[PDB]
Design a protein around this ligand. Structure first.
Ligand SMILES: Cn1cc(CC(=O)O)c2ccccc21
Ligand SMILES: [Cl-]
Ligand code: NA
Length: 445
């Protein structure tokens, strides 16, 4: 069992800590390490969680930790430091020998910043003079949704008036009471909520960019929502009905001309299933209805996230693709972490050829906070240098707006990051370069 905090070893060691959120793993455990005289770094994917550790440690233990985020760093000179993974990377990683112990919290996290952060720690900690790296999570990879004592789970059949993701919902099952239906998209939420209204039911849609008050506090209601609800709203429900699908970023080696990165419908994993289910069964018995028995277990992520790491290396952290590969290699080689196809050589080769980006476009896409700032600005750079329009006039291609009256002809398409709305040419040298990266890799070709 990995349920107890590791003892500090005499020389270097990587260990796992599996413990629930709030249980002490991010707070009590580093406090106890510091009471022993060690300097402790705690990394977390969230700015909010990171600040919150500081508030807990101060008020509960009279410990004022250092707190480091992209906005600002607060330094007390104390032995414990909380940082986001992003700020840690921006600070140069293990500029040791600063810390004796590094706790990678929520180490199941599969956002690109966490992955690159954790790989950085694993590649650098020992050389930086650390004695211990703790990979801590409340949700170890390979986790599956487990039975809940207060929630009755009932599969959907094909019997029912309301068509729902290949199955049916009987109306009797949502007439009277308060029910929550998860749909994968805002459009499905609008379609279903309209349909239910027409059937005489009290239904209302909820998603990103609507007020929480549009959900009534009392009364029979059927709420039709996306995962936006969970951040979100607080009340619980008589039942949850889950479409068991979600929208996520995926790469497709679509060869038109190269690859496509976009949001795609995919099977839901154990974490999503557990979270959606958990909106019923609070304080009384709940009901969970599902389209499909799950799941993907947790802890698998898409090759597009590896791409995103190389992107971030080049955009934010002044890392060459070769440097990024070293860090990601340490991550992939460490057992017990999230897993993904080994596309390191491929993605490295691609970014290696993306030379002479325009600095001003890159600062614009960075400041704008859109995904893949490096690839978006590189496409924009290619567009401007060819006096050609962007793939579309989506907000993505914002930096080219001032130049719009002088951009014309087909887009020299490098790859696809969203919908295509202009004529394309595939003659650009970089396009050819990226196609060759694909052909030169047996895992991708
Ligand atoms: C991409 N990215 C995320 C973070 C996390 C944070 O906001 O602390 C970050 C920090 C500094 C530089 C870049 C960063
Ligand atoms: Cl904790
Ligand atoms: Na109504």
């Amino acid at each position: 069992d990995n349920s107890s905090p590791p003892a500090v070893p005499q020389s270097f060691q990587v260990a796992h800590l599996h413990a629930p959120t709030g249980s002490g793993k991010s707070t009590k455990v580093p406090a106890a390490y510091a009471a022993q005289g060690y300097k402790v770094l705690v990394l977390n994917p969230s700015v909010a969680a990171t600040l919150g550790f500081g508030v807990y440690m101060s008020k509960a233990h009279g410990i004022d930790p250092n707190i480091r985020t992209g906005v600002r760093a607060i330094t007390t000179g104390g032995p414990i430091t909380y940082s986001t993974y992003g700020k840690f990377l921006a600070d140069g990683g293990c500029s040791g020998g600063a810390y004796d112990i590094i706790i990678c919290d929520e180490c199941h996290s599969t956002d690109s910043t966490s992955i690159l952060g954790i790989g950085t720690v694993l590649d650098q900690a020992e050389t930086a003079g650390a004695r211990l790296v703790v990979l801590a999570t409340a949700t170890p990879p390979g986790s599956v949704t487990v039975s809940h004592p207060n929630i009755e789970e009932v599969a959907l059949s094909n019997t029912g008036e309301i068509p729902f993701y290949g199955k049916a919902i009987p109306i009797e099952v949502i007439r009277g009471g308060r029910h929550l239906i998860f749909c994968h998209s805002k459009k499905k939420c609008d379609e279903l909520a309209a349909k239910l209204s027409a059937l005489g039911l009290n239904a209302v849609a909820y998603y990103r960019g609507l007020d929480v008050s549009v959900i009534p506090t009392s009364g029979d209601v059927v709420v039709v929502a996306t995962d936006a609800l969970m951040t979100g709203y607080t009340g619980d429900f008589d039942s949850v009905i889950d479409c068991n699908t979600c929208v996520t970023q995926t790469v497709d080696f679509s060869l038109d001309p190269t690859f496509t990165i976009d949001t795609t419908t995919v099977p839901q994993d154990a974490v999503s299933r557990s979270q959606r289910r958990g909106r019923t069964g609070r304080g009384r018995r709940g009901i969970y209805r599902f389209v499909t028995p799950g799941e993907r277990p947790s802890g698998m992520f898409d090759s597009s996230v590896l791409c995103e790491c190389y992107d971030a290396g080049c955009a934010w952290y002044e890392l060459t693709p070769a440097e990024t590969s070293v860090r990601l290699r340490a991550y992939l080689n460490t057992p017990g972490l999230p897993v993904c196809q080994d596309h390191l050589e491929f993605w490295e080769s691609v970014f290696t050829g993306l030379t002479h980006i325009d600095a001003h476009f890159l600062s614009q896409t960075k400041q704008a906070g859109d995904n893949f700032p490096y690839l978006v600005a590189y496409q924009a750079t290619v567009c401007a240098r060819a006096q050609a329009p962007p793939p579309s006039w989506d907000q993505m291609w914002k930096s080219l707006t001032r130049l719009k009256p002088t951009l014309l002809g087909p887009t020299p398409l490098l790859y696809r990051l969203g919908a295509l709305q202009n004529e394309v040419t595939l003659t650009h040298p970089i396009t050819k370069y990226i196609m060759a990266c694909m052909s030169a890799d047996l895992e991708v070709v």
